[PDB]
Symmetry: C3
Subunit: 361 residues, 3 copies
């Protein structure tokens, strides 16, 4: 009968290293259709979104054939972050700012100390006898923006420590709101400029048919629209039953799903002594989580009318501040060995320990 369906379905779905995580998807419908208790939904909906935040980033580079590298360049970093955009809007509209303030932070740390620190250790052992070099000038424009990102986080934090100023809490707490809803346009203009610089000004250095190819970016985002409602709506009741803090599930365990394609798609290229691509994945994804996914959520709240600023807290800011400074001194010469990467791993386990202990409301 239909001959376009027999082996093409073998070409799209099953051609991946995570074949066994698939049939835990319909049970998360079936347990929710039945009513099995809420931590058992949460255990499956972080296993039902690993081969869907990977079989979407597979289906970006098989959509550069019909559209060209101009559109196909932009959809690289767009659909590799097609989980944080789903969750950090389903959580904003459900009064749970906590998760919108950690999951958009936990993808900035995981794209800087675990996507990146593993792809220097786990490549530097393979190419220890060869010599490794990368392109500096591709990864200097990214740290300019991450310091435009950080200063927008620093100033609403320090307004909260102006208790001397003869102002109450409800006077200063709407001074953190008005200047965060105004930094968000200045963050968007320094990303729409960053596309023009990359896709038009400096383009010097910086299988499956298409009628079916659009089809598995229709359905396999809709299941991510379903298995993000189940994560967000039941994260309280599945943190009591494990005695993990919600500032550990939202900042560590949940940014393993959202960077499950940016991780095994970067340890591909670390073994080939091509660190230019495992710096275009690790850094070029953290910028959009810095400067497009964050200052769209501040606008989306303010269009809806929900109190949300850029205040992440005093403890979260020091971790984001050191991660940008340690990453800059690691990359400032263009030659890599493995000890540059083991230091980035152990500086991520420090962030895990401080947020594992912190059992505090």
């Amino acid at each position: 009968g239909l001959k376009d369906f027999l082996s093409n379905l073998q070409e799209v779905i099953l051609g991946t290293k995570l074949a066994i995580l698939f049939p835990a998807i319909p049970a998360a419908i079936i347990c929710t259709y039945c009513g099995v208790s809420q931590p058992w939904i949460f255990g499956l909906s972080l296993l039902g979104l690993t081969p869907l935040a990977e079989r979407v980033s597979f289906l970006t580079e098989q959509l550069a054939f019909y559209t060209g590298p101009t559109l196909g360049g932009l959809l690289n970093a767009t659909c590799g972050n097609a989980t944080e955009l789903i969750i950090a809007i389903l959580a904003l509209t459900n009064n749970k700012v906590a998760v919108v303030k950690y999951s958009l932070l936990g993808s900035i740390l995981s794209n800087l100390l675990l996507v990146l620190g593993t792809s220097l250790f786990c490549g530097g052992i393979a190419n220890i006898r060869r010599e490794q070099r990368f392109d500096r000038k591709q990864a200097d424009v990214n740290f300019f923006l991450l310091l435009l990102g950080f200063l927008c986080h620093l100033l609403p934090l320090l307004v909260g420590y102006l208790k001397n100023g003869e102002a109450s809490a409800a006077v200063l707490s709407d001074m953190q709101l008005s200047i965060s809803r105004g930094f968000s346009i200045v963050m968007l203009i320094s990303y729409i400029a960053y596309l023009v610089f990359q896709l038009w000004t400096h383009r010097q250095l910086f299988v499956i048919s298409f009628w079916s190819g659009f089809a598995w970016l229709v359905g396999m985002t809709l299941v991510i629209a379903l298995l993000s409602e189940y994560v967000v709506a039941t994260i309280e009741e599945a943190s009591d039953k494990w005695n993990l803090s919600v500032s550990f599930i939202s900042i560590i365990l949940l940014p393993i799903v959202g960077n499950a394609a940016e991780h095994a798609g970067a340890v591909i290229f670390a073994f080939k002594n091509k660190l230019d691509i495992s710096l275009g994945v690790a850094l070029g994804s953290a910028t959009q989580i810095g400067l497009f996914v964050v200052p769209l959520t501040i606008i989306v709240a303010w269009i809806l009318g929900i109190n949300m600023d850029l205040n992440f807290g005093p403890l979260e800011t020091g971790c984001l501040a050191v991660s940008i400074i340690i990453t800059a001194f690691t990359l400032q010469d263009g030659s890599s060995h493995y000890m540059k990467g083991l230091v980035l791993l152990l500086c991520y386990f420090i962030i895990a320990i401080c947020f594992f202990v912190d059992k505090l409301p």
Copy 2:
């Protein structure tokens, strides 16, 4: 009759791009001689000092002919800051520490993110097909001193957050006074050394007659002695009538006067692919506002006997801290395109937004 006066007056005064801002000068005498209300004096005395903080820096490089580049090098950065030295002493002696603590700060930010960030954007569009390079080694000695400047600002800030120490306010607030009056000699010795390094040790890389030439640096500082009394003595009553905060007039609008020659004398040289000079203007002026104009005002107060420390606040320090770090990563390779400059502009509009909103005593 006098033939030395006819066209020489055309040579000195009128030869500038700001011919129309001149006849707003005598009205600021005439309205003050009459008694027109105080915001109308303040509107003219920031227009009467744009072509006088430019027609003095014109009359420095026409005084290198008779004196040589040894004296003529030092008077470059001396008389381009011949407005901040006038105002930040007329405000210290009038109980208005606020302006002495912002105008000496607003010239450190404007010499790092608006003098400098415009002269990479507004040159990088002109020379986008050519290639731009500068000298790193001229602009590494300047960032050593700006980190000697910052640490002298960090420690008196953190003494104010030692409320645990079993000490009152009036015990700690004279511990911020004794260590700020003692950091100021250590800041002066690392600038008198910086002149010797530049004017004597490493000199490898680093029209109008003179009897009339001294004359228009006599009078055209005396009018700056007059139109600085009118700015300082009437800045309160001309901030109520506009509902701008005095931490916005003293930190943004007033550092457009004091850097009106350092700005159009740096966008001259950005178009010639000579960025070595638009880094000797942008950085070499911020060091003196860092390390000579600030630690002379701490001494001048203490000789007079007026309580003034180096405490600028918690909100002002984070802006000064990021501006030194973002400027260092912008300059660390010696090749410029325009996207290095648009990031420095938009990181100055963040400082404008946080101080436009802050309507707080």
Copy 3:
């Protein structure tokens, strides 16, 4: 009679530039055997340990002959810090955490701004006509670890400023204890890795008989076991009698003893235009005081059962934070003149002034 003793004793003991500081040693026994008042013991026991924290680092490089550079490399930085390890355990077991929290900090500052800043000034004047260059790649691995060290100090500081969290003091003060006893294993694994990187993976770039040679590392540590009990047990009563603060004796005057061999063993090599060795002494000693002597004391307390965290305070952290950032921009090109060194000296006198004034319990 014994011929192995006559001139060999002249070879071991007296062959040093500090012959006159020796006979102040037995008086510190004799005054303690008599009972002369306690500041007179403290004045001698910082003079009895200058030619013993030098005549031990002499007797390391005369123990590379029989053991080879594999063992003899490790004993360089081990016995040059054979005073801080003695004092910061004799003070931990005597309830005086103050000194364990300053002396392990005052050797991180003195190995970065006074061992290092003098060996660029006091060499750069000698070789001002020659040109000075060093190896960058030897001194990039050291700043990776010092930022793994700093972040372990930043997070227990900021837990103390979470008074909003609906938690008391005794709830948060054991959250600073549990995460400091857990960062200390992650600090040790990134130093045992640093030995393997140096002593086995990248060994490309990075007189006296031995039966007597072991003998003068037996006795001349035992006197350092004696003259460290006399410093620690009598530092209170010899700070009242001078009106110096104990946060000045423990952070300045006492880190002149512990870096008395790392100082005149680095100004040896600064005059020979060999700055590769005066960066392997200044930086390679600060890493062990960062990442082995500190996270062993946190374990040693916790094995004994004594409340000690990594909290050093808010004032001490800013000095440690700027010292790592100013040192990185000084070394980022591999060419030195003297003005890079005078800036590091005067940024150490700022730390002296802030802790000379601070007369506060």
